[PDB]
């Protein structure tokens, strides 16, 4: 296909226009007083939402270069959301601010590379200042408080997250589940969670969460890469006859096998889920053996002798429920005798005892922690089904927020942390004047989000920003109550991880945009 | 007439385009290797010139806003030329550089007022550095050297100007004249020059020099303002029968009298020129009395009783030759009894001796110096008439350049003085960052002219600029010989006044252009 | 007066287009086998001519920039024609060749200044080679031969010019006339010639020769510069009532007097011709006195006392016939007492002996030679009027050619001298590569004219050019006979002055044209 | 020495080369400026002045040259800016071949739009 090429200033202008469109689409939703955006649906039922993630997902322009800018900002915002769990709108507005100011400075004739260097230096100092400013959230009381605050000021969700969080451990795995009764309960079952995801997005059965779940599925453990559908065809036929979902774990599934599995999933004839084997090499075999022990199945290993055709229903692993997401996959309550689990953990412990290198000891310790820690099950119960689903969604959102908080602390939310950081860094300097201008660009960039929030509230942006700058610490302006105070003590909290990831990703995408000089796209 | 208004960025863009057109028209002629520009003549014979003054005069664009920019730059360049006698192209290119960089910075978001303040501070420091770098030219030998250098390396012109100012003084008035014979003759005759100019440009009889001259004209001295044509008309017809040009000196001439005088000049029926009286009040009346004593005529005052109607040929002053320019007016060899002049200067001397205030003594000293010093007449002779005119033009240009040099010294020409100064001012700083940006703009602007000169030479601009910057003192690159060294020794000399005036006027016009926000013009 | 400005490449493209149009219009007439061009007369009588001067005069384009190029080429060609007497087409085609090759080289990236320097060096060497190749034409027999050859191989014209030059001298003034009888008559009458021309082309009475002549006109000698029409009005009306034309000689005529004289000339009510005084200062006074003595009139001297109003018919000078051209003015057979002229020349002679400086002695020698030599009058007769006029035109053209020849010798005609010079100079080198490119451009340029001649003849240009290059000396190709040989022996003679002037003017205009970077012209 | 300074060194060495004809000399000068170009492009990407850096490198000798990352001259081999001789030689030869084909091309045949 023939390509249309834009060089230098005009290409940057087109990308700036695309970023401006996307940011103006997703910035009105920012803030407690944020507006709402109407998104058309093909069915004919317009969707009204204050969620910036959906607006960003739907937005993509018709012009090619505007589409480039919008899609790049969408990519970095989605990466920030996946890494942290929030901050998509904050990352997008930060990216727009940096891109606008940096492109203006470039149009001034200044060096883009030194501008990017200054931006990176300012953002690194900003991350350092944020780490200095963050307050700990390790204690159970603070865990409950942040869970309550995240879950629309609900004490029950925060408390439940607190007891589950203590029960499973700080590094433990927590998974939400549907509660049959009115009350909620917490349970711990034998399970593990690895960092591998689904092979293709078409495996998703519930698009509202972007994840794959199976009820009582069969687990296949293969020690070899699977590329022939005929090899596992008898197993697929047997599991389809059994009428239960099938989960396959191998080194990789690709080619006609993956295509046939995806076609079967879209046709719905059989529920088959494909996830790659975690780790690599000896570690990969170790996790395969651990998963086989946990689920009670046996791994199909070429060197031992068994093949895919010889696999049976008994050979296949079985679990109560599994959850497959793009970032990670969780196995909950596999059918396994407790004696096997105890033997396996004792074997790993004695391996640690005979282990010598620190790296191998750490890997084995992580393996044994994953295998023996278990998974905490949260059953969300309520009076009616619809509010039960709403409460479950709130619980999982609060769980993500609490996980981020306990991972890296919590700062004063509402965008005041960025302004505090800018106030701290106002004295920063760079080697070249271009680096200084880039630093100033970054400072105004982190100034921007609270200005946008208070513009959504309808108050004066500059006056509120200056008043926040005048103060010190977590003191800041509250959007909901329209009056200043200690944002942390007023119930406005944002995990440090969310803000740090948003700032870093916005800085990276803005540097890429500023340093861009040529553009290649198909003809209209 | 309906007005069209442009606000902010677009008006600045239009002015930038106009200034760019004017500067690209008048910038090629800069430098010894400067190109030439062809100017249209309605007759049918195009004019090919390397003089930037003519190109700038001919330039005025079709678009109204482009015309605004071009006319403002032309105004400031013409003011610089009138003040100094050179530097029109240098002033224009400097103004274009400052305007371009300042508009780029303004589009970058810098405060225009702070930019103008930084430009002014940098230019003031540049003037100080130029005064530090200037070398004296008081001695007769250096005077002859600079006169020879200005006159295309001709020793005769330099030496002639040398004994001319030795005879009349450093501040004495010298006028070139057409030589009767082969050998050049220097003579001193009783005359004076004051600071008043012609009322309208239409009085110009030779547009090539932009000055008014009259041969054996009649001088009318009216102590009153002249506004009625019928008052001075009978004298006008009397001198019309006299067949000689008429020069009228009065406090002011305006209205239908000036209109009819301009009409007559356009028709050419009578060559009459009008010049305002010098000074104001009692000093003005004393100056008119001195002029009447010089020319032998009698001043017409309403207080004494006589009127312009009663004035006759006897009351009219008479001079051998007068020269009227926009900046100043010169009276040469006015016929008058010598003992009368001696008595008048003795009266002024005793007035000085009885004068009490220093202001009165200074004013009377200036009056007596002008009255008694006279004017030095240079009769430029040659073998043939055409080379006689060429040598006369060279002599008058060299006289202007040498006057500027003896006024404020001389620096190394060829534009290297500006780069030297910018090298000195590398550490200049302002109160605000925008002031620093303006300072950098000014430094690059002073860098520009030598880059333009060497670009006209066809060599590399940046390399030559770096080589000149690396050196110290008057060391620089020579355009003609394409080899570096001490510019003063090679005879590449520019008067300090010329460079200083060009820099100051370029700075002023650039500040006005940068601070411009609204623009008003007639509809097309 | 809004102006349209072109910069660099496009400006030079338009300029080359204009030069190409004019050159292709005037180049077909070149050569004995040259074609003819049809020109329009507004009356309705198309003119078919082989004269390139008329074609050049008629040509001026529509577009302003094409007009610029055409008018510059026309101006330099006319200057060459005035200086020499022919070669207008040769100068134009040479200029076109240089301009085309130089603009191509400039587009190649060569420095225009170095190209112009190389062109000037090559042309200087070409002039040296042309002087080396030129043969003398001092003896009377060669004068007769060149006069015959120039006048379409007519022996009578050549011999007539021969004894005319012998009678009056090589530097003597020769003027053609109309013979009363069949046989031609040569006579010597008292007259003088000076190098002053008419003020404006509107004084021309016969546009075919571009000259002004009057039959029995009155001569007015004014010692002062003239600007007021009322001054000479009584004398103008008196000479108008006398019925004879008036010729006025003064220092200068300008303003409304010149305007009214021009108006009267085109309206034709009274035919008055104006010519500036010869020389300047005391030399001008002496020449005016000599002219007044020759014409029998009296010079109107301001310092003696008489004015233009006091001037009378008897005080006016009277001559049998005068001829005024742009380059020079001729006075023929003024009525004056012979012994008065003898006394005047005796006074000038004794001034010569009493003179001490060489320059003054040479000036007085020139004055006495002009006073005593007189003018040689050639009266051309024939059987009928039309052939008499044709013979007179041929005689005057041959006289111009013979004057050029005796001034600077004669070289081989037909454009072969340029190729001979190029063959000699093929080894020339310059300081820089661009200078070498310019030298090669000049070589191809002087190659071009014979290529054009033989292309008009219809044969191959390159073959003939290389055949001529292979030979040496005056060996070359003849257009009429289509066979090679010694052009001097074959009767193809071009005066060295004509070729030298054509080459020099083409080189100068081509250098200016190449170095052109900007033009200023009115909007369409 | 990497960073494109080897080509400029070679051009400095070959500045005295001559050909049979004037057009051959013009082609040689074209080639010399061509191998001068890449370092100019690199230092233009760095944002510094191309011509000044190019002339400064030309005035040097040996492996002395400008470094893009550190923005300061020196011995490129000592500072770790290395390019294999095969890479530079092959790039120069292939550029020469394609430029020779392009320059001598006179006719082009393509399908209609």
Swiss-Prot record, chain D:
Q: Summarize what the UniProt record says about post-translational modification.
A: Phosphorylated reversibly during heat shock. Can be UMPylated on a tyrosine residue by SelO/YdiU, probably under stress conditions.
Q: Which domain of life is it from?
A: Bacteria
Tell me which positions the record assigns to the signal sequence. none
Tell me the residue numbers annotated for binding ATP.
3, 67-69, 83
Cellular compartments annotated: Cytoplasm
Q: How does it assemble?
A: Forms a cylinder of 14 subunits composed of two heptameric rings stacked back-to-back. Interacts with the co-chaperonin GroES. Can form asymmetrical complexes, composed of one GroEL and one GroES, and symmetrical complexes, formed between one GroEL and two GroES oligomers. The asymmetrical complex is the functional unit. It was suggested that the symmetric heterooligomer may represent a transient intermediate in the chaperonin protein folding cycle.
Similarity comment text for this entry = Belongs to the chaperonin (HSP60) family.
Primary role:
Together with its co-chaperonin GroES, plays an essential role in assisting protein folding. The GroEL-GroES system forms a nano-cage that allows encapsulation of the non-native substrate proteins and provides a physical environment optimized to promote and accelerate protein folding, probably by preventing aggregation and by entropically destabilizing folding intermediates.
Q: What is known of its domains?
A: Each subunit is composed of an apical domain that binds non-folded proteins and GroES, an intermediate domain and an equatorial domain that binds ATP and is involved in inter-ring interactions. Forms a large central channel that appears to traverse the entire length of the cylinder with no obstruction. The central channel of GroEL functions as two cavities, one in each ring, that are separated from each other by the crystallographically disordered 23-amino-acid C-terminal segments of the seven subunits. The entry and exit of polypeptide seem to be restricted to the apical end of each ring. Modulating the volume of the GroEL central cavity affects folding speed in accordance with confinement theory. Small proteins fold more rapidly as the size of the cage is gradually reduced to a point where restriction in space slows folding dramatically. For larger proteins, either expanding or reducing cage volume decelerate folding. A stepwise reduction in cage size results in a gradual loss of cell viability.
Q: What is this protein called?
A: Chaperonin GroEL
